[PDB]
């Protein structure tokens, strides 16, 4: 009886929040860029951060201000303190009484008055000024909330009797659901009233807190003169279950919304979203008497696209059906056939609009598996699309491939595992890939009824491969397209973007070709080779792209010597930069050959000498323009004895330098415990030659346990002026890195250092000297000295002499930070703590997140400005009551010393102060 009472009882969960807060600022800069970075790269926790960490948009705690109640993001350029503070953002008044906001330090540059608006002289001269000061008037807030949770025992459903011509028994199937429900008192700030059914908040839908006054917030509170507060009670629930399965042994029928299914690639790659609402039936004949050892299986799908959706949507009156059948006659070779169809009904043929084909009918067969020591992967498809309209003129498009290679479990092809193995280690000829491709030009995700895909995933990386992990397009080979200059509006000149990149028009050409990658394992020797030619579907050599190559390695004792030859002959246009540095579209010929020798004495040390020679379009081509990466079979070898693996990808980042110019911390990464500067490569294949010693601390029997350094020298070829055939190895790069953690006593030291003396502009790094050093100390609590002190520390210096074609400017930075925590302070359970941080910078800047996956970074700019961010943060604690105080100042002067901080132009820095009293309480 007690269990029955508990099953359907409410758990009452009240919550109380108590806290005092005051904050005064004049510019709202950011202070999270001063705090130490943890070994996982996260910044140390403080009581002043505004938050804002978003992985989707790349936002971090360092992209927003931390004072007042405002989280104003930092603004790049001069409007912000070069990414250090908030923008100036004048306000512009209009004649009709409307207003706009101008984001700049000079309103005169407001070159965007709308068509009919005229600046009315209402403010200073029609331009106002948005106040840069934010205030949080000191107050103590008590927040009270209450929720009612359920026992969570309603996770099952049992079927009931049904039927009209008959009556089912009932209680035959038990389904596990994922319903999470309870009672809430108040609505979240992000709730809304969805009046359209799209499931998303359209333009100002309802603001559910505004629909139910008194639900939450401060705008409305349903009160009582006696002091009572009333809040509406809502029933909140999530239903994560949309599929219901019936039947156990041979036959299982699943009914639900947005059914996800997969016949094969090129036909019903309809998982990762699903296609619509309906049912799927799966029949497994693995226990049949006569034929059950072949594991016969049948799948059948019926559904309506997107369920019910309004007209003008692609899935209105459109229904899909399909059936697949497969077996495994041999060890693992599964062979299957499948029929798929999608079409409009009489209500979709009329009043649907869009462009969905009147009918698509695809047939196919596939032969994936591993049977007799070899792995086969084949696929055939036929489309027969009915292109709506009136005449239609049904169009057919096939897609066939046959590959002898190893597919992973995620259906991506692993080209590093042979799958042939025609011998042992002494004589070990290994076939890695042997494939043919006949994808037609008109075969897209509509031809074979899928969600996405069947197009080059990169067009710059391996562009014959359609495999797209983002959209779940599991398909080995892609529908290639031909690229050409656009010339949309202007005539005579090709259209370009603002950055100068070309604008291309892509026409699908399909794909047809073959490719073999193999390697023969000798004894102390090993050899490998690859060949690959792909044309358009029609076979015209105007779209051919052939890559051939081969490598040979000899490794013995502690010496290894490799030699690689790579070619790329692309009559296919290809987009790339020329010698001058302007993007172009046109055929390419790349010839590379690299001989690199390595010696490993075994004491953790290593030495490496290399000579790599690129040759683009017949000229020596100081740097290849990424063309060699257009093929998916690169297959270089690796140094070391007994390492005869022919792994795909030309390891161009081997024994060469790094060209990074961005960093999370103020100093050039030498103060970031999540960045190993000695393992930073450029990943660009150069026409150069050089040597590089080093030392690894993770390798056992090393001189120093945790020590890594990467001293190295190199010389890079550069043409005579810009495009001359003649040239010389005049460029010179001398680089060095070091990293040493150690733990002397109770403290935990960490040293990092980097150097560079480049002579030319390699990828984006200018030509000049570049050095950096950083030290991090973190003492554990001392149990001998009174107060149990626990110290910290941080120092970082960065220097760079950027010799760019527009200046010879020096960009240096200096970051420091110290702090001591007293874990035993007078009264019991009393703690005190103080941390002082500082960051000075010459011509450097911060670039905030771009709103995409890219994050913000500190870089060098020629802005003649010196930033002087400083702050002190004192955190004391009684038993569990935390007093946090913080005072920070940001001043950005110029060479003269004008002190542009606090940009009202009064010669005063921006200042921020905060005081908080925090107290966490639980019921």
């Amino acid at each position: 009886r007690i269990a029955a009472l508990e099953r359907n009882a409410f758990s009452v969960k009240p919550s109380l929040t108590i806290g005092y807060s005051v904050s005064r600022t004049s510019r709202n800069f950011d202070v999270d860029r001063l705090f130490p970075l943890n070994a996982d790269g996260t910044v140390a926790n403080n009581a002043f951060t505004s938050g804002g960490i978003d992985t989707d948009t790349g936002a971090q705690r360092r992209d927003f201000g931390d004072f007042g109640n405002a989280s104003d993001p930092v603004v790049a350029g001069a409007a912000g303190l070069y990414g250090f503070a908030d923008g100036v953002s004048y306000t512009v008044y209009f004649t009709d009484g409307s207003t706009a906001t101008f984001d700049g330090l000079n309103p005169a540059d407001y070159k965007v008055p709308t068509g009919k608006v005229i600046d009315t002289t209402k403010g200073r001269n029609g331009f106002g000024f948005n106040n840069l000061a934010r205030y949080k008037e000191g107050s103590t807030d008590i927040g009270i909330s209450l929720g009612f949770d359920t026992s969570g025992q309603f996770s099952q459903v049992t079927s009931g009797t049904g039927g009209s011509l008959f009556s089912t028994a009932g209680r035959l199937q038990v389904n596990q659901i994922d319903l999470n429900f309870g009672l809430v008192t108040g609505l979240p700030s992000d709730a809304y009233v969805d009046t359209n059914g799209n499931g998303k908040k359209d333009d100002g839908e309802a603001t559910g807190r505004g629909t139910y006054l008194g639900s939450g917030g401060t705008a409305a509170i349903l009160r009582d003169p006696a002091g009572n507060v009333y809040r509406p009670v809502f029933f909140r629930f999530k239903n994560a279950t949309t599929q219901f399965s019936v039947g156990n042994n041979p036959v299982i029928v699943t009914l639900g919304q947005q059914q996800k299914f997969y016949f094969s690639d090129y036909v019903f790659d309809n998982n990762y979203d699903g296609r619509g609402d309906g049912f799927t039936v799966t029949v497994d004949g693995s226990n049949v008497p006569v034929i059950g050892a072949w594991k016969p299986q049948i799948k059948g799908v019926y559904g309506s696209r997107s369920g019910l959706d309004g007209t003008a949507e692609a899935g209105y009156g459109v229904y899909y059906r399909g059936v697949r059948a497969q077996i495994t006659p041999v060890g693992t070779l599964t062979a299957g056939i499948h029929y798929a169809q999608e079409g409009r009904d009489m209500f979709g043929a009329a009043q649907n609009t869009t462009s969905t084909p009147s009918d698509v009918t695809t047939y196919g067969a596939d032969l994936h598996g591993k049977a007799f020591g070899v792995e086969l992967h084949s696929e055939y498809a036929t489309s027969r699309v009915r292109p709506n309209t009136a005449n239609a003129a049904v169009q057919t498009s096939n897609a066939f491939y046959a590959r002898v290679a190893t597919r992973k479990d995620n259906l991506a092809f692993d080209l590093n595992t042979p799958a042939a193995k025609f011998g042992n280690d002494t004589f070990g000829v290994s076939l890695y890939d042997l494939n043919y491709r006949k994808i037609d030009a008109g075969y897209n995700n509509v031809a074979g009824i899928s969600e996405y895909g069947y197009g080059s995933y990169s067009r710059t990386s391996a562009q014959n491969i359609a495999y797209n992990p983002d959209t779940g397009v599991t398909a080995p080979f892609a529908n290639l397209d031909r690229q050409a200059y656009t010339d949309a509006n202007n005539d005579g000149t090709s259209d370009r973007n603002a950055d100068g990149t070309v604008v291309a028009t892509n026409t699908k050409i399909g794909q047809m070709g073959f490719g073999v990658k193999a390697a023969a394992n000798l004894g102390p020797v090993a050899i490998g080779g690859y060949y690959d030619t792909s044309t358009g579907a029609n076979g015209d050599n105007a779209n051919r792209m052939t890559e051939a190559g081969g490598s040979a390695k000899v490794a013995y004792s502690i010496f290894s010597l490799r030699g690689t030859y790579n070619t790329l002959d692309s009559n296919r246009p290809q987009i790339y930069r020329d010698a001058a540095g302007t993007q172009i579209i046109g055929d390419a010929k790349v010839r590379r050959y690299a001989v690199q020798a390595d010696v490993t004495p075994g004491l953790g040390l290593f030495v490496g000498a290399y000579y790599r020679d690129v040759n683009v379009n017949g000229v020596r081509s100081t740097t290849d323009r990424g063309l060699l990466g257009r093929g998916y079979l690169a297959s270089s070898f690796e140094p070391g004895v007994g390492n005869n693996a022919y792994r795909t990808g030309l390891r161009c980042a081997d024994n060469n330098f790094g060209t990074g110019t961005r960093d999370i911390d103020g100093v050039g990464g030498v103060l970031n415990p999540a960045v190993n500067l000695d393992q930073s490569r450029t990943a660009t294949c150069f026409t150069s030659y050089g040597v590089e010693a080093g030392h690894a601390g993770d390798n056992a029997n090393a001189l120093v346990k945790d020590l890594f350094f990467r001293v190295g020298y190199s010389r890079v070829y550069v043409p005579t002026t810009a495009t001359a055939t003649t040239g010389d190895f005049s460029g010179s790069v001398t680089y060095g890195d070091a990293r040493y953690d150690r733990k002397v006593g109770v403290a935990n030291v960490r040293l990092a250092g980097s150097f560079s003396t480049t002579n030319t502009q390699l990828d984006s790094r200018p030509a000049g000297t570049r050095g950096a050093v950083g030290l991090i100390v973190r003492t554990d609590p001392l149990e001998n000295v009174p107060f149990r002190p626990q110290f910290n520390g941080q120092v970082g210096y960065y220097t760079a002499d950027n010799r760019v074609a527009a200046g010879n400017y020096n960009a240096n930075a200096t970051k420091y930070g110290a702090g001591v925590v007293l874990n035993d302070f007078l009264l019991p359970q009393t703690k005190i703590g103080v941390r002082y941080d500082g960051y000075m910078a010459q011509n450097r800047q911060y670039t905030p997140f771009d709103g995409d996956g890219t994050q913000g970074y500190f870089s060098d700019a020629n802005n003649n400005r010196r930033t002087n961010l400083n702050g002190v943060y004192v955190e004391g604690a009684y038993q569990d009551l935390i007093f946090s105080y913080g005072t920070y100042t940001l001043s950005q002067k110029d060479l003269n010393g004008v002190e542009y901080g606090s940009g009202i132009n009064n010669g005063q820095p921006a200042r921020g102060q905060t005081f908080k009293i925090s107290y966490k309480v639980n019921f």
Partner: peptide, 27 residues
């Protein structure tokens, strides 16, 4: 075919108690 439904109907048991029943192997 390959599944087993088992209906143990018990009577004269304890008024409102829970009765977890399963299959104990030979041991």
């Amino acid at each position: 075919l390959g599944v087993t439904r088992t209906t143990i109907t018990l009577t004269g048991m304890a008024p409102y108690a829970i009765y977890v029943a399963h299959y104990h192997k030979m041991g």
